[PDB]
Each structure stands twice: as structure tokens, then as C-alpha cells.
Amino acid sequence: EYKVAILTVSDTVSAGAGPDRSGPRAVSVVDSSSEKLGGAKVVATAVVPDEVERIKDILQKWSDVDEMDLILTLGGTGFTPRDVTPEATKKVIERETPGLLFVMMQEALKITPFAMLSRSAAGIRGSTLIINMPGNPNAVAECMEALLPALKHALKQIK
Amino acid sequence: EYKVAILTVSDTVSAGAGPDRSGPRAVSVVDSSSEKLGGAKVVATAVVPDEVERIKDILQKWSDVDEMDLILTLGGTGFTPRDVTPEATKKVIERETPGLLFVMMQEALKITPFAMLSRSAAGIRGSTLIINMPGNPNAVAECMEALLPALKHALKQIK
Amino acid sequence: EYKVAILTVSDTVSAGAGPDRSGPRAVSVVDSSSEKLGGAKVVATAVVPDEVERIKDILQKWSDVDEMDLILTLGGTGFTPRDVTPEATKKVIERETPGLLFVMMQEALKITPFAMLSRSAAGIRGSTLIINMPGNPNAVAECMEALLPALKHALKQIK
């Protein structure tokens, strides 16, 4: 009923130099949150390198052509010079959703102060909600737990 | 002494299809916060539909021509495709006031996690402070309570 | 090992009409946080008036030409019409670092609600981290305490 897609952003994974350890975790978190999200299913994944054009193209495609309801990105959100996910994300979103970002930061900071190094963006494009999430496997579970109480209503409101 | 104006953003109310239930609440909250705000009075209200041009025009007019000290908007801050108040507001403000947004979000989240679905913007234009607030009648009371400790000094500082 | 530079923004100080009371405090906070920051030293200070061009030029110079690792600005962050530091900073940064802002706001609000009147910006330009901090002498000590747990890793990540 809600079409979720998960974008892994990683030079390493994209080059075939390493496995995606976060993608599967994210899929499985969404999957077991399905009821709480009002019926949602991961319907597509993709891997891109840490390059803004590659990130933008997918977000555009998944929003404008495939009409996903929810896109989660993983990675490319830190202080490393290659971390460009938020900049790519900011170019393509139309309506910022700063409350989602406030909640993720607030909860993540309860676990570790290193949370302050996340530079995630989030917003709506067309009728797709796009949320940047950190690249390590536990992050999606933690962010999804923080957002989950309200994310169902978020997706319903977007229509 | 401080001139407050309150803008209701709502297709329904603007079309005459329904009453403004939030406007009068906001007026009355400002009014009974007058002492705490250093002497403030709601001096004008207006209703506009959920259209960016209509919203921008009023914010411009009230800031540039009427020289309001404080403009509160109500509504148009959610995830609904018609909710365009923050996008309108972002076009017309000059200096962001992210602390006001942090406080409103932080307090609202203590009451309900659905607070994360607010996309309010806020900032200064010329010498007018503009704050987006949620469309339901209790929200202005709650946001004003969150901001009130420091809003007096905010208005003084703007001159 | 990390090159820190501290910019004081103040019409009064720049004109010679008054001393810098915050500058020396900031230098001394960085200095005595050196170990915790992985070896950092204030290597340069400058004073500029409350004018965006003056502020931008220095941030550009210190980032592009001198290659500072960390720039702290002091002052020009409130609601006063001359307070233009964040606007100047926003023009020169490339990658926002909103978690640093979230943390400073969160911690400052524990001390006083007037913290919500800070409009600080922060972000990375090239490989320089720029953080706006408030103009009063105790602020840099407080903000640095809030950021310190993670700022070492921030500077390492930027390279």
C-alpha cells in the first residue's frame, strides 16, 4: 500500500569493493514496521556512489517517474568531503520537513553525542517523502523508531 | 505599543465555506499575553487561501507598508499538498530565527509526537518578526507559551 | 595541528570604541580544550564591523587562502538589525552542519530561554568548519563545552 524505496549511497558499495550491510537492515526494519506504517513495503533498492548527480537522478526518478511514497537514503551524511547526500537531497526536495530532522537528531543524541555529526536533510518532492539517514546498519532502526509514532500520519497526509 | 497582525491561511475559510476557529483564539492569546510581551495588541487580521502568492503579498504588505511588529500565521504548515505557508514565508523573510522554531518544536513534542509534522518557518523581514504556527485553535496558545519567556526581548531587539 | 581562527564581529570593537572582551575568552577556551580537540591552537584573530561583505571576505580568505581548519565567529547573531553574521556565514558555507546548531541551541536553552534568540549558522567551506557563536564572553565556553565531545571527530572527518 505505501511504496518504500531505499537508496544506499556509498562509493565502496557502488564500485563492487564491498557489501551493503545497511541496505538489508533498512529493508527489514521497514518491513517489520509495516503495520505501524499503515501497510508499507520496500519495493526497490539502488546503490549509487558518493556523487550528487547520481543521487539527484535517482531521487528524481523515484519521485517523478516511479512515484514512490517514501524514499530512505543511507549514507553520505557526515563531515567527510565525499559525504554529499544532503546537498543532493536539498536540490530535489520542494517542501522541507524539519520536524522529522529535529526528532531524529533529538533521539540520536540520547544515544551518543556523535549524533551531532549527522547532516541529514529531509523533505517532500511531489508526493514522495525523502529522508536522509546515516550509513551504519543500526541507524535506520533507531531513526525509524524515532519517527514511527507519526510517520504513518505523514504518509497519509501526503495523500 | 507592539503591533501584532494574525494571518489565517485556509482554503475553506477564505472561500466562506467555514468559520475561522483559530483566528479568534490567537487574538485572544496575544491579547492576554500583552503585559508579558511588553504591551502588544492585535491590530489586524486577514484570511487567505492556501496559495503562495496570496500569502507572500500579505506578509510583504504587513511588513513593508503597514510596518507590523509581529505577524503570526495560522495553518498551512503540514504535509498536505496544499500546505504551502512555510514555502511562502521562506520567500519573504530576510533573517532566519531558528531558535524560535527549535523551541516551538521542542515544546510541542512534549505533548505529542505528531508535532514533528509541523513544517513551520519563522524569520525577520525589515523590522517585522514573522512566525508560522499550526492551524488548530490550541496551537497558538501552546506556541505562545513556549516562546513567551523571550519574545518580549525579541521584539525589543528588532527595535 | 588543527589551525583555529577566531573572528570577532562588532561595530564597537572594529571602530576602536571598545575592547574585545570575548575574543580573548574564546582563544583561551580553545587553548585549554586543545587535548580534547586532538591538538588545536588559535593561530589568528581578526575584528570586523557588523557588515556582511567584511564578514564574508574574512571567512573566504581564512578558508580558501589560509586554510584554517576551524573558524569560530563571535557576535552578530541576535535580533538587532545590525546582527548579520549568520547571513554572511550562509553565503560562504557549502555544506550545512545542522547537528552542531542543534546541540548548541539545546544546551544553551538549559541555561536560559533567551538562547532561542540566537540565530547562529554553521557549516563547512572547502575543508574549513565555520561555527557562529554568541558575542558575550561566557558563550564560547558554553558552546564549546556542548560541542566538545564530538568536535575532535568532526575535524578529523573533514580531513
Side-chain angles (χ1 to χ4, degrees), chain A residues 94-100 102-103 106 124 126 129 146-151 153-155 157-159, chain B residues 78-84 86-87 90 101-103 105-107 109 113-120:
Chain A
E94 294 159 349
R95 299 194 290 136
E96 298 169 7
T97 54
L100 304 186
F102 185 109
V103 178
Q106 192 180 46
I124 301 161
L129 184 64
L147 296 176
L148 212 22
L151 202 48
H153 200 57
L155 294 168
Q157 273 186 215
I158 290 157
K159 245 83 225 27
Chain B
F79 278 45
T80 286
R82 290 288 288 179
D83 289 320
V84 294
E87 293 63 42
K90 276 150 185 193
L101 298 181
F102 185 106
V103 174
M105 182 67 61
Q106 187 181 50
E107 301 301 318
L109 282 162
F114 295 107
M116 85 183 67
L117 308 175
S118 153
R119 308 182 315 99
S120 292

Side-chain angles (χ1 to χ4, degrees), chain A:
Chain A
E1 134 92 76
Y2 289 127
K3 295 197 251 187
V4 192
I6 304 194
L7 177 64
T8 284
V9 186
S10 172
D11 278 337
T12 291
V13 180
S14 167
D20 186 353
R21 284 186 241 266
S22 304
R25 253 45 90 95
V27 170
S28 135
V29 168
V30 168
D31 211 55
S32 83
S33 289
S34 181
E35 225 226 298
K36 266 255 201 50
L37 284 168
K41 189 216 216 141
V42 186
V43 123
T45 65
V47 179
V48 295
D50 294 290
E51 284 156 33
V52 283
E53 293 305 315
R54 291 296 306 281
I55 302 156
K56 280 191 266 181
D57 286 351
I58 286 285
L59 298 177
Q60 277 165 9
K61 191 170 153 303
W62 282 358
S63 304
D64 307 346
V65 176
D66 303 307
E67 288 182 321
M68 308 298 332
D69 304 301
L70 176 68
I71 304 175
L72 295 179
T73 63
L74 321 178
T77 55
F79 279 46
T80 285
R82 291 285 289 177
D83 285 320
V84 295
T85 300
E87 293 62 45
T89 301
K90 277 148 185 192
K91 290 281 190 55
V92 314
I93 66 118
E94 294 159 349
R95 299 194 290 136
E96 298 169 7
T97 54
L100 304 186
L101 294 183
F102 185 109
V103 178
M104 290 192 289
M105 184 67 60
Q106 192 180 46
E107 300 304 316
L109 283 165
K110 292 180 179 154
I111 295 163
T112 165
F114 296 104
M116 87 182 65
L117 309 177
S118 151
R119 311 185 309 102
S120 298
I124 301 161
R125 172 174 182 109
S127 58
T128 298
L129 184 64
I130 309 178
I131 309 177
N132 298 336
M133 283 179 185
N136 47 272
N138 281 334
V140 180
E142 290 155 3
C143 295
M144 197 76 16
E145 195 183 333
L147 296 176
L148 212 22
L151 202 48
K152 183 190 182 201
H153 200 57
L155 294 168
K156 197 170 131 131
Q157 273 186 215
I158 290 157
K159 245 83 225 27

Side-chain angles (χ1 to χ4, degrees), chain C residues 79-149:
Chain C
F79 279 45
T80 283
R82 290 288 286 178
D83 290 319
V84 296
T85 299
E87 293 62 45
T89 301
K90 279 149 183 193
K91 290 281 186 58
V92 316
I93 67 119
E94 291 163 346
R95 302 193 287 137
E96 299 167 6
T97 55
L100 304 184
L101 295 182
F102 185 106
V103 174
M104 287 190 292
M105 183 68 56
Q106 191 183 45
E107 298 304 319
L109 280 165
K110 290 179 181 159
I111 294 164
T112 170
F114 296 106
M116 86 180 67
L117 307 175
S118 155
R119 309 185 309 101
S120 303
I124 301 164
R125 168 171 184 114
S127 49
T128 297
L129 183 62
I130 311 182
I131 313 179
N132 295 338
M133 285 178 181
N136 49 271
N138 279 333
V140 183
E142 289 153 9
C143 295
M144 197 79 15
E145 193 182 337
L147 295 179
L148 211 22

